[PDB]
Amino acid sequence: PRTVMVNLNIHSDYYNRSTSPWNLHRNEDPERYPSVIWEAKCRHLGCINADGNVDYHMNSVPIQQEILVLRREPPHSPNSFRLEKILVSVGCTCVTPI
Amino acid sequence: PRTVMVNLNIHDYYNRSTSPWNLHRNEDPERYPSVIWEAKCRHLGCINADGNVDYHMNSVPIQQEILVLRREPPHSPNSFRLEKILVSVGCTCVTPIV
Ligand SMILES: Cc1nonc1C(=O)N[C@H](c1nc(Cn2c(=O)n(C)c(=O)c3ccc(Br)cc32)n[nH]1)C1CCCCC1
């Protein structure tokens, strides 16, 4: 139990040209801070080629990143949390299949 | 002043990418997490089907806004303020603007 105090008060259109473009999904969880997390979801299974068409010889895959969130502890607590690790998609990349 | 308590105790396929990246260690003693891994694109262009770098496309880092804890007052072991920073989470391949 290393309890610390945190003051919660704090003081893109280029990725549309990507060969593995993605859309943003709003992920809401009332038991978490931040309650709203934007998760990227790849638009296509393949990648956009030179002609602007979807080529299935390449794959758009999401980039999964481990992020820290605050989980309310005990549940529904407005002022006490525990640090937690979750996996979120931050964008998409284009990979050459195996 | 939205002060909350936080218990700090918590409970590569992207090598085949056309816009591959490496990880850079970013350290800050006045921040939690003190160590953040920032992605840095390996090439200016994108790896094509033949395995060669094509400069008609660009590898660009995907910048995401993340929350960190800044020690407040400075050097405080137990009190922080939430802070927004921009981090590179990976790289994508974009078709440049003409
Ligand atoms: C956005 C967002 N949407 O929801 N939550 C968040 C969020 O930013 N949460 C904070 C956070 N998690 C991380 C995880 N992280 C990490 O540990 N290392 C060590 C990394 O190299 C790293 C690299 C890239 C990314 Br991307 C993340 C990385 N960094 N910052 C968290 C909030 C509560 C107080 C403690 C900090």
UniProtKB/Swiss-Prot annotation, chain A:
Induction: Induced upon differentiation of CD4-positive T cells. Up-regulated by IL23A-IL12B. Up-regulated in peripheral blood mononuclear cells upon West Nile virus infection. Its main location: secreted. Expressed in memory Th17 cells (at protein level). The keyword Signal applies. GO terms for biological process: adaptive immune response; apoptotic process; cell death; cell-cell signaling; cellular response to interleukin-1; defense response to fungus; defense response to Gram-negative bacterium; defense response to Gram-positive bacterium. The keyword Secreted applies. Coiled coil: none annotated. One of its GO terms (cellular component) is extracellular space. Disulfide bonds join C42-C92, C47-C94. N-glycosylated. Found both in glycosylated and nonglycosylated forms. Glycans are attached at N16. It is found in: Secreted. Homodimer. Forms complexes with IL17RA and IL17RC receptors with 2:1 binding stoichiometry: two receptor chains for one interleukin molecule. IL17A homodimer preferentially drives the formation of IL17RA-IL17RC heterodimeric receptor complex. IL17A homodimer adopts an asymmetrical ternary structure with one IL17RA molecule, allowing for high affinity interactions of one IL17A monomer with one IL17RA molecule (via D1 and D2 domains), while disfavoring binding of a second IL17RA molecule on the other IL17A monomer. Heterodimer with IL17F. This is Interleukin-17A. One of its GO terms (molecular function) is cytokine activity. Belongs to the IL-17 family. Effector cytokine of innate and adaptive immune system involved in antimicrobial host defense and maintenance of tissue integrity. Signals via IL17RA-IL17RC heterodimeric receptor complex, triggering homotypic interaction of IL17RA and IL17RC chains with TRAF3IP2 adapter. This leads to downstream TRAF6-mediated activation of NF-kappa-B and MAPkinase pathways ultimately resulting in transcriptional activation of cytokines, chemokines, antimicrobial peptides and matrix metalloproteinases, with potential strong immune inflammation. It comes from the Eukaryota. Keywords: Adaptive immunity, Cytokine, Disulfide bond, Glycoprotein, Immunity, Inflammatory response, Innate immunity, Secreted, Signal.
